[PDB]
Design a binder for this molecule. Structure first.
Ligand SMILES: Cc1cc2nc3c(=O)[nH]c(=O)nc-3n(C[C@H](O)[C@H](O)[C@H](O)COP(=O)(O)OP(=O)(O)OC[C@H]3O[C@@H](n4cnc5c(N)ncnc54)[C@H](O)[C@@H]3O)c2cc1C
Length: 427
């Protein structure tokens, strides 16, 4: 500790988002001086364009130690526990293949120690016992895994609760032109701070880039991360319709989509499941020699007249017709795109930059990292301090050329928004 923890200054770029807010939290909890920690975001915490700024996210149960460590904190941490809604989760499958995959997943969870809280549902009867709001006609031939531990996360409220703690402790903040990263400040091969769009300079000993889907746009990542959009929309229930779904399990079918119990206002959110969309644009990230075609997020917060593609509407209507056939005439409203960045292998990118000393990447969220909100900052702090477990250091390493992130671990290469009509309502 060249400076000690107490004397180390750290800038967290994207500190209004999932990984960034977690990092700031763990710096303060670890004993960094709060006023030595600066959170920079394009938008105030919880950032309007953060993938974590939503009513709800699912808690994926999986045979993953990092996810397990996060799940413990969602159950027990004084800050996080109140934002976890343990309603259970139903993972459903149909066809003689998706069912084979689900059976292998089930066996994997049992092998890893989850036998007491995971159940195999081998028939329509068994599915309807766990989710009686479904309709037999729509689930013919389905099988499911029920995860008793499992549920949904009040995502924006969790990030806001972090923001309140950081403010109360004395963390420094910069937003808008004073928070929008433009470039690292480098000197003699070392990163010694950040410059924002408006020309404000911040000097620090270490800088973390936790800019989510914006990370490959801000600095040269050699296509390790490719940014893609997922879609959702909303339906409004009457008070009596809503009461039928109170504390109901999350339902997911990889072939269809997923949905959540209604919020306090009777609104259900419905998501597609698909390989995501790029939005290619010429852009020159810091460190690129010239402009290049990269997927650049089309931010709903900056372009609030945007919706989602016509093809996404078709798929979400199909999700509603399957899960919720009695609500098929309800309008789908507040349609929006949300952005994530995929790696080729779907693992995180948590590493020091190989040339810019003291600049650290904390991205590659790969569409499945909101569940890690409580724990991920601990790993980032351990990276800064040189104490991250070897296995995780290897898994999350700098790895350009390690495969094609446009397809990643998904079913197909993502299609581009330029080719998908229906979302753009600009002049
Ligand atoms: C539709 C949808 C459904 C999802 N469902 C789930 C789910 O059920 N379960 C799950 O675990 N995960 C889910 N996710 C994934 C999860 O939301 C993400 O993996 C995670 O939130 C990404 O965290 P992040 O910190 O990398 O990015 P973000 O939370 O998006 O944060 C990045 C931050 O960088 C900031 N930033 C951008 N540009 C700049 C700049 N120039 N300067 C400074 N700051 C900047 C942004 O404003 C933002 O606040 C879902 C995502 C989507 C899109």
């Amino acid at each position: 500790m060249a400076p000690s923890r107490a004397n180390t200054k750290v800038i967290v770029v994207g500190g209004g988002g999932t990984i960034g807010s977690s990092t700031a939290l763990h710096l303060v909890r670890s004993g960094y001086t709060p006023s030595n920690v600066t959170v920079l975001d394009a938008y105030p915490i919880p950032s309007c364009q953060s993938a974590g700024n939503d009513l709800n996210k699912i808690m994926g149960v999986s045979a993953d130690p990092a996810a397990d460590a996060a799940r413990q904190m969602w159950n027990e941490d004084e800050l996080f526990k109140k934002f976890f809604h343990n309603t259970g989760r139903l993972d459903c499958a149909h066809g003689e293949k998706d069912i084979a995959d689900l059976k292998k997943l089930y066996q994997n969870l049992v092998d890893w120690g989850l036998d007491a809280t995971v159940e195999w549902l081998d028939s329509e009867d068994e599915i309807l016992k766990r989710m009686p709001q479904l309709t037999r006609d729509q689930i013919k031939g389905w099988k499911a895994i029920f995860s008793k531990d499992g549920g949904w996360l009040a995502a924006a409220k969790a990030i806001k609760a972090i923001g309140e703690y950081l403010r109360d402790q004395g963390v420094r903040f910069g937003f808008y032109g004073a928070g929008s990263f433009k470039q690292p400040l480098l000197a003699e091969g070392v990163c010694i701070g950040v410059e924002t769009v408006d020309g404000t300079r911040y000097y620090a000993d270490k800088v973390v880039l936790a800019a989510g889907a914006w990370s490959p746009t801000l600095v040269e990542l050699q296509e390790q991360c490719v940014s893609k959009a997922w879609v959702y929309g909303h339906i409004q229930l009457t008070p009596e319709e809503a009461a039928r779904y109170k504390n109901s399990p999350v339902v997911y079918n990889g072939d269809v989509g997923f949905f959540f119990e209604p919020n306090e206002h009777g609104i259900i959110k419905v998501c597609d499941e698909f390989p995501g969309f790029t939005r290619f644009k010429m852009h020159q990230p810091f460190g690129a020699k010239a402009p290049k075609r990269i997927s650049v997020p089309r931010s709903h917060c900056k372009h609030p007249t945007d919706t989602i593609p016509d093809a996404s509407i078709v798929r979400i209507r199909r999700a509603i017709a399957t899960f919720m056939p009695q609500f098929k005439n309800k309008p789908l409203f507040n349609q929006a795109m949300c952005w994530c960045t995929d790696t080729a292998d779907g693992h995180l990118l948590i590493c020091e930059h190989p040339e810019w000393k003291n600049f650290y990447l904390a991205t590659g969220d790969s569409g499945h990292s909101f569940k890690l909100l409580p724990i991920i900052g601990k790993y980032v702090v351990e990276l800064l301090e040189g104490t991250l477990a070897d296995e995780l250091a290897h898994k999350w390493r700098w790895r350009p050329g390690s495969g094609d992130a446009l397809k990643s671990r998904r079913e197909a290469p993502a299609k581009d928004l330029a080719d998908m009509p229906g979302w753009n309502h600009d002049h």
